Short mmCIF file of all heavy atoms in Angstrom, two decimals:
data_model
loop_
_atom_site.label_atom_id
_atom_site.label_comp_id
_atom_site.label_asym_id
_atom_site.label_seq_id
_atom_site.Cartn_x
_atom_site.Cartn_y
_atom_site.Cartn_z
N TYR Y 42 14.54 -5.46 -3.00
CA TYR Y 42 14.51 -6.86 -2.50
C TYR Y 42 13.39 -6.99 -1.47
O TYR Y 42 12.22 -6.76 -1.80
CB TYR Y 42 15.90 -7.27 -2.00
CG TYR Y 42 16.98 -6.98 -3.00
CD1 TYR Y 42 17.80 -5.88 -2.87
CD2 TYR Y 42 17.16 -7.81 -4.11
CE1 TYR Y 42 18.76 -5.60 -3.80
CE2 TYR Y 42 18.13 -7.55 -5.04
CZ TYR Y 42 18.93 -6.44 -4.89
OH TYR Y 42 19.91 -6.15 -5.82
N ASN Y 43 13.68 -7.41 -0.25
CA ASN Y 43 12.69 -7.62 0.79
C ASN Y 43 12.88 -6.66 1.94
O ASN Y 43 12.28 -6.85 3.01
CB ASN Y 43 12.77 -9.06 1.32
CG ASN Y 43 13.23 -10.05 0.27
OD1 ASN Y 43 12.78 -10.01 -0.88
ND2 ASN Y 43 14.15 -10.95 0.66
N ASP Y 44 13.72 -5.64 1.75
CA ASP Y 44 14.15 -4.81 2.86
C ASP Y 44 13.06 -3.80 3.21
O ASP Y 44 12.24 -3.43 2.38
CB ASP Y 44 15.44 -4.10 2.50
CG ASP Y 44 16.64 -5.00 2.65
OD1 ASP Y 44 16.48 -6.21 2.93
OD2 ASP Y 44 17.76 -4.48 2.52
N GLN Y 45 13.05 -3.38 4.47
CA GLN Y 45 12.08 -2.43 4.97
C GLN Y 45 12.80 -1.24 5.59
O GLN Y 45 14.01 -1.28 5.81
CB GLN Y 45 11.18 -3.07 6.02
CG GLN Y 45 9.96 -3.71 5.44
CD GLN Y 45 9.08 -4.29 6.52
OE1 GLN Y 45 8.26 -3.59 7.16
NE2 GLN Y 45 9.26 -5.58 6.77
N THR Y 63 6.38 -3.49 0.17
CA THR Y 63 6.39 -3.92 1.57
C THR Y 63 6.29 -2.73 2.51
O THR Y 63 5.44 -2.70 3.40
CB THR Y 63 7.66 -4.74 1.83
OG1 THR Y 63 7.65 -5.88 0.96
CG2 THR Y 63 7.72 -5.21 3.25
N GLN Y 67 3.18 -1.30 4.78
CA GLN Y 67 3.31 -1.05 6.21
C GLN Y 67 2.77 0.31 6.57
O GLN Y 67 2.04 0.47 7.55
CB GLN Y 67 4.76 -1.20 6.63
CG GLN Y 67 5.22 -2.62 6.56
CD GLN Y 67 4.97 -3.36 7.85
OE1 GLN Y 67 3.82 -3.61 8.24
NE2 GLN Y 67 6.07 -3.76 8.51
N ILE Y 82 -3.04 -6.55 5.08
CA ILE Y 82 -2.01 -6.72 4.06
C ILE Y 82 -2.05 -8.17 3.57
O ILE Y 82 -2.05 -9.11 4.37
CB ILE Y 82 -0.62 -6.38 4.63
CG1 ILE Y 82 -0.63 -5.07 5.41
CG2 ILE Y 82 0.44 -6.37 3.52
CD1 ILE Y 82 0.71 -4.79 6.05
N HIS Y 84 -0.30 -11.07 1.02
CA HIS Y 84 0.86 -11.51 0.25
C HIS Y 84 0.36 -12.37 -0.91
O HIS Y 84 -0.37 -13.33 -0.68
CB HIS Y 84 1.83 -12.27 1.14
CG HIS Y 84 3.11 -12.65 0.47
ND1 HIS Y 84 4.06 -13.42 1.09
CD2 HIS Y 84 3.60 -12.36 -0.76
CE1 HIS Y 84 5.09 -13.60 0.28
NE2 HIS Y 84 4.83 -12.97 -0.85
N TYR Y 98 3.05 -7.57 -2.37
CA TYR Y 98 2.15 -7.23 -1.26
C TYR Y 98 1.20 -6.13 -1.71
O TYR Y 98 1.63 -5.12 -2.28
CB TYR Y 98 2.88 -6.74 -0.01
CG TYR Y 98 3.74 -7.76 0.69
CD1 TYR Y 98 5.12 -7.65 0.65
CD2 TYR Y 98 3.18 -8.81 1.41
CE1 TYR Y 98 5.91 -8.53 1.30
CE2 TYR Y 98 3.97 -9.73 2.07
CZ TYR Y 98 5.35 -9.58 2.00
OH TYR Y 98 6.20 -10.47 2.64
N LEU Y 137 -1.12 -15.95 -1.39
CA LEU Y 137 -0.11 -16.69 -0.64
C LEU Y 137 -0.35 -16.69 0.86
O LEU Y 137 0.02 -17.65 1.54
CB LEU Y 137 1.29 -16.13 -0.93
CG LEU Y 137 1.91 -16.36 -2.31
CD1 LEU Y 137 3.36 -15.87 -2.37
CD2 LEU Y 137 1.83 -17.84 -2.65
N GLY Y 138 -0.95 -15.64 1.39
CA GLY Y 138 -1.16 -15.51 2.82
C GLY Y 138 -1.38 -14.06 3.24
O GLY Y 138 -1.29 -13.13 2.45
N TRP Y 139 -1.65 -13.91 4.52
CA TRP Y 139 -1.93 -12.63 5.15
C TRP Y 139 -0.74 -12.21 6.00
O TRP Y 139 -0.24 -13.00 6.80
CB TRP Y 139 -3.20 -12.74 6.00
CG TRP Y 139 -4.41 -13.12 5.19
CD1 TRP Y 139 -5.05 -14.33 5.15
CD2 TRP Y 139 -5.13 -12.27 4.28
NE1 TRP Y 139 -6.12 -14.29 4.28
CE2 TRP Y 139 -6.19 -13.03 3.74
CE3 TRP Y 139 -5.00 -10.93 3.89
CZ2 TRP Y 139 -7.11 -12.49 2.83
CZ3 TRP Y 139 -5.89 -10.40 3.00
CH2 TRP Y 139 -6.93 -11.18 2.47
N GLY Y 140 -0.29 -10.96 5.84
CA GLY Y 140 0.80 -10.40 6.61
C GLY Y 140 2.10 -10.38 5.82
O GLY Y 140 2.22 -10.94 4.73
N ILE Y 141 3.09 -9.68 6.39
CA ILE Y 141 4.45 -9.67 5.87
C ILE Y 141 5.22 -10.87 6.42
O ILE Y 141 5.13 -11.18 7.61
CB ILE Y 141 5.17 -8.36 6.25
CG1 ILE Y 141 4.26 -7.12 6.11
CG2 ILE Y 141 6.47 -8.20 5.49
CD1 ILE Y 141 4.22 -6.50 4.75
N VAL Y 142 6.02 -11.52 5.58
CA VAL Y 142 6.89 -12.58 6.09
C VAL Y 142 7.91 -11.97 7.05
O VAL Y 142 8.47 -10.91 6.79
CB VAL Y 142 7.57 -13.32 4.93
CG1 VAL Y 142 8.12 -12.38 3.98
CG2 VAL Y 142 8.74 -14.17 5.44
N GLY Y 143 8.11 -12.63 8.20
CA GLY Y 143 9.02 -12.11 9.20
C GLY Y 143 10.47 -12.43 8.89
O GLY Y 143 10.81 -13.04 7.87
N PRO Y 144 11.35 -12.02 9.80
CA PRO Y 144 12.77 -12.35 9.66
C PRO Y 144 13.05 -13.79 10.06
O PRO Y 144 12.31 -14.41 10.83
CB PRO Y 144 13.44 -11.39 10.64
CG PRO Y 144 12.46 -11.38 11.77
CD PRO Y 144 11.08 -11.41 11.11
N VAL Y 145 14.15 -14.31 9.56
CA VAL Y 145 14.58 -15.65 9.96
C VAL Y 145 15.29 -15.59 11.31
O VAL Y 145 15.91 -14.60 11.68
CB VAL Y 145 15.48 -16.31 8.91
CG1 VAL Y 145 14.88 -16.19 7.52
CG2 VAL Y 145 16.88 -15.74 8.98
N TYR Y 146 15.20 -16.70 12.04
CA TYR Y 146 15.96 -16.90 13.27
C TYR Y 146 16.69 -18.23 13.13
O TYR Y 146 16.08 -19.23 12.72
CB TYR Y 146 15.03 -16.93 14.50
CG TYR Y 146 14.27 -15.65 14.76
CD1 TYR Y 146 12.90 -15.58 14.51
CD2 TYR Y 146 14.90 -14.51 15.27
CE1 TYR Y 146 12.20 -14.44 14.74
CE2 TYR Y 146 14.20 -13.34 15.51
CZ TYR Y 146 12.85 -13.32 15.24
OH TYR Y 146 12.14 -12.17 15.47
N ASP Y 147 17.97 -18.27 13.46
CA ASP Y 147 18.66 -19.55 13.55
C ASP Y 147 19.92 -19.39 14.39
O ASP Y 147 20.18 -18.31 14.95
CB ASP Y 147 18.97 -20.11 12.15
CG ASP Y 147 20.02 -19.30 11.41
OD1 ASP Y 147 20.71 -18.49 12.09
OD2 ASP Y 147 20.15 -19.47 10.17
#
Side-chain angles (χ1 to χ4, degrees):
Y42 310 101
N43 329 316
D44 280 6
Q45 270 182 83
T63 300
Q67 291 270 68
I82 313 176
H84 186 184
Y98 293 110
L137 289 186
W139 299 106
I141 318 273
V142 47
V145 312
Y146 298 108
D147 69 15

